[PDB]
Design an enzyme around this catalytic site. Structure first.
Site, mmCIF file in Angstrom:
data_model
loop_
_atom_site.group_PDB
_atom_site.id
_atom_site.type_symbol
_atom_site.label_atom_id
_atom_site.label_comp_id
_atom_site.label_asym_id
_atom_site.label_seq_id
_atom_site.Cartn_x
_atom_site.Cartn_y
_atom_site.Cartn_z
ATOM 1 N N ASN A 138 0.570 -0.881 0.084
ATOM 2 C CA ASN A 138 -0.052 0.252 -0.012
ATOM 3 C C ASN A 138 0.775 1.409 0.268
ATOM 4 O O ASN A 138 0.115 2.095 0.356
ATOM 5 C CB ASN A 138 -0.705 0.164 1.449
ATOM 6 C CG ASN A 138 -1.758 1.227 1.462
ATOM 7 O OD1 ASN A 138 -2.585 1.489 0.367
ATOM 8 N ND2 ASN A 138 -1.779 1.229 3.016
ATOM 9 N N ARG A 143 -0.765 2.383 -7.278
ATOM 10 C CA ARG A 143 -0.511 0.988 -7.945
ATOM 11 C C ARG A 143 -1.659 0.517 -7.048
ATOM 12 O O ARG A 143 -1.927 -0.615 -7.559
ATOM 13 C CB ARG A 143 1.059 1.151 -6.751
ATOM 14 C CG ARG A 143 1.317 -0.711 -6.883
ATOM 15 C CD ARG A 143 1.545 -0.593 -8.716
ATOM 16 N NE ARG A 143 2.237 -1.809 -8.743
ATOM 17 C CZ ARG A 143 1.989 -2.884 -9.863
ATOM 18 N NH1 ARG A 143 2.783 -1.688 -11.248
ATOM 19 N NH2 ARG A 143 3.194 -3.564 -10.131
ATOM 20 N N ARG A 193 3.756 -10.466 -4.426
ATOM 21 C CA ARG A 193 2.511 -11.099 -3.078
ATOM 22 C C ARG A 193 1.286 -12.131 -3.742
ATOM 23 O O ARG A 193 1.083 -12.644 -2.953
ATOM 24 C CB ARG A 193 1.682 -9.764 -3.000
ATOM 25 C CG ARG A 193 2.710 -8.480 -1.656
ATOM 26 C CD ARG A 193 2.796 -7.381 -2.355
ATOM 27 N NE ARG A 193 3.277 -6.688 -1.142
ATOM 28 C CZ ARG A 193 2.472 -7.260 1.044
ATOM 29 N NH1 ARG A 193 1.143 -8.411 1.304
ATOM 30 N NH2 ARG A 193 3.101 -6.558 1.902
ATOM 31 N N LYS A 238 0.688 -4.781 10.368
ATOM 32 C CA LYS A 238 0.101 -3.298 9.799
ATOM 33 C C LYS A 238 -1.204 -3.592 8.647
ATOM 34 O O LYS A 238 -2.519 -2.951 9.142
ATOM 35 C CB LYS A 238 0.788 -2.442 9.207
ATOM 36 C CG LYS A 238 0.829 -1.309 8.257
ATOM 37 C CD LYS A 238 0.177 -1.628 6.253
ATOM 38 N N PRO A 255 -3.777 1.903 12.486
ATOM 39 C CA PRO A 255 -2.445 0.774 11.207
ATOM 40 C C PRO A 255 -1.245 1.819 11.013
ATOM 41 O O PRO A 255 -1.514 2.837 10.980
ATOM 42 C CB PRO A 255 -2.850 0.697 9.253
ATOM 43 C CG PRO A 255 -4.335 0.911 9.888
ATOM 44 C CD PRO A 255 -4.761 1.473 11.383
ATOM 45 N N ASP A 257 2.615 2.266 9.722
ATOM 46 C CA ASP A 257 3.729 2.352 8.310
ATOM 47 C C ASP A 257 4.327 3.619 8.226
ATOM 48 O O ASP A 257 4.094 4.473 9.648
ATOM 49 C CB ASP A 257 3.029 1.839 7.020
ATOM 50 C CG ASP A 257 1.609 3.600 6.923
ATOM 51 O OD1 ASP A 257 1.728 4.170 7.453
ATOM 52 O OD2 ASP A 257 1.152 3.300 5.599
ATOM 53 N N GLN A 276 14.064 1.038 22.649
ATOM 54 C CA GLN A 276 15.132 1.917 22.069
ATOM 55 C C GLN A 276 15.830 1.811 20.722
ATOM 56 O O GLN A 276 15.893 3.322 20.876
ATOM 57 N N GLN A 304 -7.373 8.995 12.188
ATOM 58 C CA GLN A 304 -6.175 8.551 11.263
ATOM 59 C C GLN A 304 -6.925 9.499 9.750
ATOM 60 O O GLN A 304 -5.915 9.258 8.759
ATOM 61 C CB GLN A 304 -5.558 7.392 10.997
ATOM 62 C CG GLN A 304 -4.568 6.562 10.456
ATOM 63 C CD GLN A 304 -3.808 5.489 10.742
ATOM 64 O OE1 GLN A 304 -2.734 5.112 11.170
ATOM 65 N NE2 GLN A 304 -5.287 4.130 10.201
#
Length: 312
Positions: A138, A143, A193, A238, A255, A257, A276, A304
């Site tokens: 995504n 695409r 995929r 995700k 989600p 990313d 960290q 979001q």
């Protein structure tokens, strides 16, 4: 061909819906569903439940039309069909309540909301959402939109042709679980995929007791649904969160990313404090998501979506 409200008014029926509650142009091409196109100005055509619809709005109404093909007489959507549209758009949720809450806790949100009104989170079919997000990265809406179109052309039932556009239903498990699916998807340009599309269809059909497994996750907790999805080839944290948010009725899912990180840094100056790590990682991504859930509340994934519409 494609209908407009102006050209064929008697084939359209309406849903009361102020433009404050819904802006089609800010929702349908924003990276939630990939099945819509503005084939005529202000008119969005696409597949909603393995039927082709065109949608358009006036100030206080959502106008809808559905294409039935040669088996049935052409007629306005029935009340039950229109309810299906309302459910897709989750119109029983009052967006104004959410927008006011999110702006109350987040000045940046309140700023963006002034221009990006009526951004709603669609309620998508679990198969369609799962396999749309499995079939392509995504990274670019264009695409994934193209890949989904190819997938449906390849393995989805032909619904109707309008002008130069042949619309297909979303593929069934059985279609996607076939021998030769991977190879045929790679031949169309899907790349690695394609294997996950095939394997996940076979996994659900052969190992998880079919479609019901996936449908049951709508009723299951966010925690159970996320874990269950992560068993599937091609689904990590995700994608599982995307599906939870967009098709399994978990509005709290956020989600994470590189896109969300960019918004967190650009617009919030956010840095991780648990991990960290300075950058994306399983632990820092979890932290980031929990941050926005904590900030925005139980509908954080919907908030979001407003920011994603604004970022396009």
């Amino acid at each position: 061909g494609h209908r407009t409200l102006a050209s064929t008014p008697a084939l359209w029926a309406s849903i009361p819906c102020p433009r404050s509650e819904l802006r089609l142009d800010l929702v349908l091409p924003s990276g939630q569903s990939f099945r819509w196109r503005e084939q005529s100005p202000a008119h969005w055509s696409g597949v909603l439940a393995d039927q082709v619809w065109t949608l358009t709005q006036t100030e206080e109404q959502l106008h809808c039309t559905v294409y039935r093909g040669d088996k049935s007489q052409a007629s306005r959507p029935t009340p039950d069909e229109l309810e299906a549209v309302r459910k897709y758009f989750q119109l029983d949720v009052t967006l104004a309540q959410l927008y006011h809450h999110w702006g109350s806790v987040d000045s940046h949100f309140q700023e963006v909301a002034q221009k990006f009104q009526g951004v709603r989170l669609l309620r998508q079919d679990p198969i369609e959402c799962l396999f749309s997000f499995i079939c392509s990265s995504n990274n670019n809406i264009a695409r994934i939109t193209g890949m989904v179109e190819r997938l449906c052309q390849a393995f989805g039932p032909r619904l109707i042709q309008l002008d130069d556009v042949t619309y297909h239903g979303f593929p069934s498990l059985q279609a996607l679980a076939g021998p030769e699916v991977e190879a045929h998807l790679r031949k169309l340009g899907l790349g690695y995929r394609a294997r996950y599309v095939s394997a996940s269809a076979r996994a659900i059909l052969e190992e998880q007791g079919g479609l019901a497994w996936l449908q049951q996750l709508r009723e299951s907790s966010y925690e159970e649904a996320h874990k269950a999805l992560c068993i599937l080839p091609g689904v990590g944290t995700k994608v599982a969160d995307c599906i939870c948010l967009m098709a399994l009725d978990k509005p709290q899912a956020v989600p994470v990313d590189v896109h969300m990180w960019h918004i967190a840094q650009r617009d919030y100056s956010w840095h991780p404090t648990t991990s960290q790590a300075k950058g994306p990682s399983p632990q820092t991504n979890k932290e980031l998501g929990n941050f926005f859930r904590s900030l925005w509340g139980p509908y954080a994934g919907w908030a979001q979506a407003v920011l994603f519409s604004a970022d396009l």
